[model samples]
Target: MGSHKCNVCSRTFFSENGLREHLQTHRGPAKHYMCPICGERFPSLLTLTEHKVTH
Candidate 1:
């Protein structure tokens, strides 16, 4: 049963732990994982790392 609920907004997850992890994004500072060479923003470190090779 997806019983996890986000306190900041209306969102549910299968586990409360999932909700806790998701809340960090809203509570914490925005992470700019961008490519230094081209100034493109990426959501994941793996994508940013691979993108650098293209540059």
Candidate 2:
């Protein structure tokens, strides 16, 4: 499988199509975060940054 990932959450996607689709949410045009941890999305780089900081 391909190893593309979202920089915001570090969640893995299969390809560029998946990454672009996912990155849309950071711009607010997209309304959902599909990679949920405990029923929540890792939406922005800020949130991912925070998660990494705390983790």
Candidate 3:
């Protein structure tokens, strides 16, 4: 049988459905730290504060 590969990481699934389910881990939480100036996204407030310095 052909294996399905994950686009985001080094993982393989025996079926396409399994791969789709595994991909959810990469989707993660909603981005709450969005830059108002450039509309960029950061995962955490500390990173967002650092990124804002570039503006």
Candidate 4:
């Protein structure tokens, strides 16, 4: 068996296409907010703020 892995998060996928799609989460829209500490992306400031608290 073979697997594809995410370079950013080390998540495994069964197909190259799935891994490519998953990369979008790390390379999202330019307007989206990103965490300075961990580089986690978020769709909105509200969610980013909430996520930062967990750090």
Lowest lDDT block of 10, candidate 2 = 30-39
Off by over 4 Å in 3: 1-31
Q: Which prediction has the highest lDDT against the true structure?
A: 4
Q: Where does candidate 1 stray beyond 4 Å?
A: 1-32
- Candidate 3 per-residue lDDT, tens place, 1-55, comes to 7567787886566568888888786867755588878888888777888899977
> What lDDT does the true structure give each of the candidates?
0.74, 0.64, 0.77, 0.79
Over 1-55, each residue of candidate 2 has an lDDT whose tens digit, in order, gives: 7566787888666578978787767777543343334445576656755665565
Off by over 4 Å in 2: 30-55
| Candidate 4 pairs with clashing backbones | none
lDDT, residue 30, model 1: 55
Ranking by lDDT: 4, 3, 1, 2
TM-score of each: 0.40, 0.36, 0.39, 0.41
Model 3 root-mean-square deviation: 5.3
- Give a tens-digit lDDT track for model 1, residues 1-55: 6456876777555477777788787745655477789889887777888888976
Superposed model 4: Cα runs more than 4 Å off: 1-31
Clash pairs detected, candidate 3: none
Clashing pairs in 2: none
Higher-scoring candidate on TM-score, 1 or 2: 1
